[PDB]
Subunit: 89 residues, 11 copies
Amino acid sequence: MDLLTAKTIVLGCSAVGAGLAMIAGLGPGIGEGYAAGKAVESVARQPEARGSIISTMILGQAVAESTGIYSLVIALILLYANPFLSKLG
Amino acid sequence: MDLLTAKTIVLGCSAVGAGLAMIAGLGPGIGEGYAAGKAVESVARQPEARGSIISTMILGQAVAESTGIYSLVIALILLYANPFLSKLG
Amino acid sequence: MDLLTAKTIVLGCSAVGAGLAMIAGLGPGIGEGYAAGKAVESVARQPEARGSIISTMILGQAVAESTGIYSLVIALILLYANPFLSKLG
Amino acid sequence: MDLLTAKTIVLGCSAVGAGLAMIAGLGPGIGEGYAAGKAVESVARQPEARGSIISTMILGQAVAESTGIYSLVIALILLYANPFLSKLG
Amino acid sequence: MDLLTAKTIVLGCSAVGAGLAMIAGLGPGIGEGYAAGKAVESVARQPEARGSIISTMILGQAVAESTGIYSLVIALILLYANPFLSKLG
Amino acid sequence: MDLLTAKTIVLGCSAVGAGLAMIAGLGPGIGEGYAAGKAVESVARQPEARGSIISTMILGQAVAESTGIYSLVIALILLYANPFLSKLG
Amino acid sequence: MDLLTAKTIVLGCSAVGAGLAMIAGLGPGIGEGYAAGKAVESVARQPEARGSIISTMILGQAVAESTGIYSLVIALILLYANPFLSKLG
Amino acid sequence: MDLLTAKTIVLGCSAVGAGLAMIAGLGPGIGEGYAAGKAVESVARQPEARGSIISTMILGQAVAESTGIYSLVIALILLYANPFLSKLG
Amino acid sequence: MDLLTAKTIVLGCSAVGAGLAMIAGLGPGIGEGYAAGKAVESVARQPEARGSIISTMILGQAVAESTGIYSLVIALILLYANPFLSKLG
Amino acid sequence: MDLLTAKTIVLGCSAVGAGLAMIAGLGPGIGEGYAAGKAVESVARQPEARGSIISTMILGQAVAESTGIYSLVIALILLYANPFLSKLG
Amino acid sequence: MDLLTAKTIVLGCSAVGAGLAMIAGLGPGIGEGYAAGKAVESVARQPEARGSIISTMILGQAVAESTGIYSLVIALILLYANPFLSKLG
Ligand SMILES: CCCCCCCCCCO[C@@H]1O[C@H](CO)[C@@H](O[C@H]2O[C@H](CO)[C@@H](O)[C@H](O)[C@H]2O)[C@@H](O)[C@H]1O
Ligand SMILES: CCCCCCCCCCO[C@@H]1O[C@H](CO)[C@@H](O[C@H]2O[C@H](CO)[C@@H](O)[C@H](O)[C@H]2O)[C@H](O)[C@H]1O
Ligand SMILES: CCCCCCCCCCO[C@@H]1O[C@H](CO)[C@@H](O[C@H]2O[C@H](CO)[C@@H](O)[C@H](O)[C@H]2O)[C@H](O)[C@H]1O
Ligand SMILES: CCCCCCCCCCO[C@@H]1O[C@H](CO)[C@@H](O[C@H]2O[C@H](CO)[C@@H](O)[C@H](O)[C@H]2O)[C@H](O)[C@H]1O
Ligand SMILES: CCCCCCCCCCO[C@@H]1O[C@H](CO)[C@@H](O[C@H]2O[C@H](CO)[C@@H](O)[C@H](O)[C@H]2O)[C@H](O)[C@H]1O
Ligand SMILES: CCCCCCCCCCO[C@@H]1O[C@H](CO)[C@@H](O[C@H]2O[C@H](CO)[C@@H](O)[C@H](O)[C@H]2O)[C@H](O)[C@H]1O
Ligand SMILES: CCCCCCCCCCO[C@@H]1O[C@H](CO)[C@@H](O[C@H]2O[C@H](CO)[C@@H](O)[C@H](O)[C@H]2O)[C@H](O)[C@H]1O
Ligand SMILES: CCCCCCCCCCO[C@@H]1O[C@H](CO)[C@@H](O[C@H]2O[C@H](CO)[C@@H](O)[C@H](O)[C@H]2O)[C@H](O)[C@H]1O
Ligand SMILES: CCCCCCCCCCO[C@@H]1O[C@H](CO)[C@@H](O[C@H]2O[C@H](CO)[C@@H](O)[C@H](O)[C@H]2O)[C@H](O)[C@H]1O
Ligand SMILES: CCCCCCCCCCO[C@@H]1O[C@H](CO)[C@@H](O[C@H]2O[C@H](CO)[C@@H](O)[C@H](O)[C@H]2O)[C@H](O)[C@H]1O
Ligand SMILES: CCCCCCCCCCO[C@@H]1O[C@H](CO)[C@@H](O[C@H]2O[C@H](CO)[C@@H](O)[C@H](O)[C@H]2O)[C@H](O)[C@H]1O
Ligand SMILES: CCCCCCCCCCO[C@@H]1O[C@H](CO)[C@@H](O[C@H]2O[C@H](CO)[C@@H](O)[C@H](O)[C@H]2O)[C@H](O)[C@H]1O
Ligand code: NA
Ligand code: NA
Ligand code: NA
Ligand code: NA
Ligand code: NA
Ligand code: NA
Ligand code: NA
Ligand code: NA
Ligand code: NA
Ligand code: NA
Ligand code: NA
């Protein structure tokens, strides 16, 4: 096996691996969508409390967002800063 | 391995990886759909407050949209600005 | 490898990638169905607000449709404007 | 590679991608079923508004169906108007 | 590659695509079951409105069934009216 | 490729295709479960209407069952009346 | 190829297919679990009607169990009454 | 093909098939957890009806466990009472 | 085929099969989490009955845990007490 | 087959198998999230009961976590104490 | 097999396995989002309790986050501190 073959296989697997990691993004999309609906209902029933409600929404959603970011970071690593390449040469 | 074989395998894996990443889009669809439903419900109870209600809906949905955008970017990178090619030669 | 073999595998992987991307469309189907169901319910309780109900539904459903559109775009690119072909040689 | 081998792989992959795409159909199935159930409970509680309830059900369901149509079209294309065949010769 | 090999591979990928397509059938199973649940509950509360209740259920369920039917059509095509064969010559 | 190799591959893919299709059975499993629960609650609340409730449960569950049967038929066809065999021999 | 090879591949694919088919069992597990929860709640609110409530629960679960059985029959066929073997040698 | 090769492939496939079957166990876990939750809620409100609330819970959970057992049996057969080795020779 | 190759393939397949089986663990995670949720609001509303509430939760969750254990067992067997090795070959 | 080839393949399958096992962690995330939401709702209603609410939350969440831990243990075993290598040499 | 091929195939499998592990992150995303929605709703209805409402959310979400963190750790190990390399040469 030459070096070109080594990179080809590893980067190819890296591409598939990156795609698989990104699937996790469906979760925050669902969970934050729920926090959004609750906010819509809450500002409707109690308009004078709007600012407090939005802050609580953004705070809650930001936390729910993290595992989305984890997947993104993993993907970007496999794409732009692949740790495997240095192990071949 | 010749270069043409190397690129073929990598770009092919990139196509599959891109499709997998896009699956995440199901999440925001569900989540934002929920936010839509609550707006519908809230507008019926308080038709005069519509403006503030959709305003809150859009803000929430926008945040719920992000992980969909992350996947789209990753896919578009793999298709149009593939980072693996330069590593192959 | 010759050119015909290159395109063949890249296009083949592109077809699968397109199919995978379109799976995301299940999301909006669920989410918008939820908005639809809330519209039905709302029209039944406040029938006088039917016009405001329907227009809120459409708008919210339009927003939740977006990631379904993203996937469709990715799939059509892969099928009709494949950006891998011109990278092979 | 000869034309037949090139056609074989491209069409074989096209068959899998089309099947993958059709998986999206479960979404509208769930979402529309929800709208249907809300319609049932509503014409019972409010039999005076049956016309506008069923009218609202159909419209909301139709919008919810669109991504199912998207995937069906992609499948139909891969099946009957395959765009990869022309890239082969 | 000879014609028998061509047909073998293409048909094999078709059997798999068909199975994948049929997966979508889980959606309508969930949605229509929900519509049935509301119908059961509605018949109990308004025993005399059973006619309109059930009629509403069937109509809504029929709509929800459609994408399960699309998948069944795609599968039957791949099995009994395969469009790929006439391309191999 | 000889006849035996052809039949082996296409039948092998057919077994996998049948199993994939059978995955759709989870849907009616869930949906009909929901209708069952609503029946348990409703019969306990409205004993005078038991027969009308159970009858409503069965009809609704039967409609929900349909896509499960579709899958079962496709699986049965692939297993006992395989339509690919006459295209290979 | 020889007989042993033909049978090996087919029986091998049949193992995976049987496994895939069994995945559908998750549905009835969810659906019936839901019916059980409703039974519990009904019994709590009306302890004297425990026998009647249970009876309704078992009936509704029997119906929900059906597609799990379908998947089980398909898997048992592939393992014990494999219809592909007579198609080979 | 020699006998060892035949045994290796089928058992290899059998191992994968067994794991796929076990995936189904997730359903019963969800459904029974729901029943468990209803028991917890019911025991608190009607503590006089405990035991009767518990026994109903166990019964319902027992029923919901069935498809999980089916998958266990299939997995146990593939691992210990493999019905394919008998066909190899 | 030699015995080292035979064991390599069978164990490799066994590793994947163990991973697949463990996926089932998500179900009990969802179900028991629900039971925990009901327990929390019950002890809030009915502080005196805390002993009975925690007791029902543990029992109910124990039941829901079983299929998770079934999968853990299958996995452990595949890893430490592999029943395939002694049939090679 | 040489030893290095044997180890390569079995470890390669172990990496994939471990990744599959970790997928189960999505369950506890959903489940424990639900428990957390019930705690929030409960602390809002009985702010003074916060301490006992947290205790119950932590308990049930701990139970719900178990199958996540199982999956993790299975993965760490495959990575750090692989039970297959000894069978190969 | 030489060292380069061994490293290559293992790292390649490690990338995929890393991606599979990251899928679990969707769970916490859903779960934490749910807790977020409850906070949004609670904070509105009970302004005097915002402090304990928010703190309870953060705590519960943190517990819900753990299995995502586990998957992240596994992925980071496979990418940056690969345990299989040490066993090849
Ligand atoms: C998930 C989707 C996966 C899709 C995978 C598609 C894989 C396509 C592989 C192509 O590799 C070629 O197919 C050729 C044609 O049938 C072979 O003979 C071709 O190559 C030969 C040398 O190996 C000689 O005939 C000449 O070089 C050339 O004809 C060639 O097998 C092998 O190189
Ligand atoms: C999840 C995604 C998984 C993706 C897996 C993709 C696997 C792609 C395999 C491509 O096959 C390789 O092609 C090289 C180029 O043809 C061969 O080396 C060549 O140069 C080598 C070094 O000289 C020579 O030995 C020969 O030409 C041949 O062996 C090499 O052996 C062969 O394996
Ligand atoms: C943080 C986000 C940053 C986004 C940055 C986007 C930058 C895009 C630069 C162009 O991207 C790719 O670079 C490859 C490498 O230059 C090009 O392949 C070209 O060069 C390769 C060799 O380097 C060859 O193998 C290819 O065949 C040849 O097309 C490829 O076409 C091009 O799309
Ligand atoms: C999920 C996505 C999966 C994507 C998988 C893609 C797999 C690609 C496998 C390619 O296999 C190699 O293809 C080369 C052709 O591309 C062959 O070259 C040969 O035939 C070539 C021409 O086709 C000739 O140039 C020579 O024989 C040598 O160069 C080589 O033997 C063959 O092993
Ligand atoms: C969605 C799933 C799609 C799956 C598509 C699968 C397509 C498979 C195409 C196989 O094509 C054949 O592959 C052989 C290899 O298998 C080639 O010969 C090659 O086999 C070797 C490949 O290097 C040569 O070196 C040897 O001489 C030769 O017999 C042969 O020419 C080629 O036509
Ligand atoms: C989910 C989808 C799964 C799809 C699986 C598809 C599997 C395809 C397997 C490989 O096909 C090989 O194809 C060669 C193609 O050429 C044949 O070649 C043979 O007949 C060839 C000519 O057709 C001859 O050159 C020789 O027998 C050898 O080269 C023969 O079938 C076999 O070696
Ligand atoms: C979910 C999808 C699962 C897909 C599984 C696909 C499995 C494909 C197995 C292919 O098996 C090979 O086929 C070749 C076909 O050619 C055989 O060639 C032999 O018999 C051939 C003719 O059929 C002869 O030419 C020679 O023995 C050699 O060329 C060879 O023995 C056989 O092992
Ligand atoms: C769901 C999983 C399904 C898995 C199915 C796996 C099927 C494997 C069939 C293997 O049959 C063997 O295949 C070899 C090739 O791999 C043949 O190689 C032998 O023949 C070859 C092809 O002609 C070349 O290696 C040289 O010619 C010769 O080694 C060999 O005779 C043939 O018996
Ligand atoms: C999810 C399922 C995964 C399945 C993975 C495993 C698939 C099958 C792998 C290969 O098994 C092959 O069987 C051939 C026989 O059919 C062997 O032939 C050899 O021994 C043969 C005779 O037994 C000889 O002819 C030669 O060594 C060559 O032809 C060959 O070495 C061996 O590798
Ligand atoms: C999740 C499923 C993963 C499945 C992974 C399967 C990986 C491939 C397994 C089979 O590999 C073959 O084994 C043969 C031995 O059985 C080797 O024989 C060789 O050494 C043999 C004798 O030991 C010789 O006869 C020849 O080199 C050829 O016949 C052959 O080269 C090698 O390719
Ligand atoms: C869950 C993911 C699991 C991924 C598992 C990936 C396993 C990859 C195994 C690759 O094994 C190699 O395959 C070569 C063939 O492609 C063999 O070539 C040999 O036998 C070949 C024919 O089978 C011969 O041509 C020569 O011995 C050489 O070319 C070689 O020995 C064998 O080590
Ligand atoms: C998701 C997981 C995906 C895993 C994909 C793994 C793909 C592995 C392809 C391996 O191809 C084999 O090993 C070497 C690659 O170059 C080549 O043999 C050659 O190279 C070896 C490594 O240098 C030597 O040991 C052999 O002697 C020599 O014939 C062999 O022909 C080639 O088929
Ligand atoms: Na998070
Ligand atoms: Na987001
Ligand atoms: Na959107
Ligand atoms: Na739509
Ligand atoms: Na429809
Ligand atoms: Na139906
Ligand atoms: Na049924
Ligand atoms: Na059952
Ligand atoms: Na259980
Ligand atoms: Na647990
Ligand atoms: Na946790």
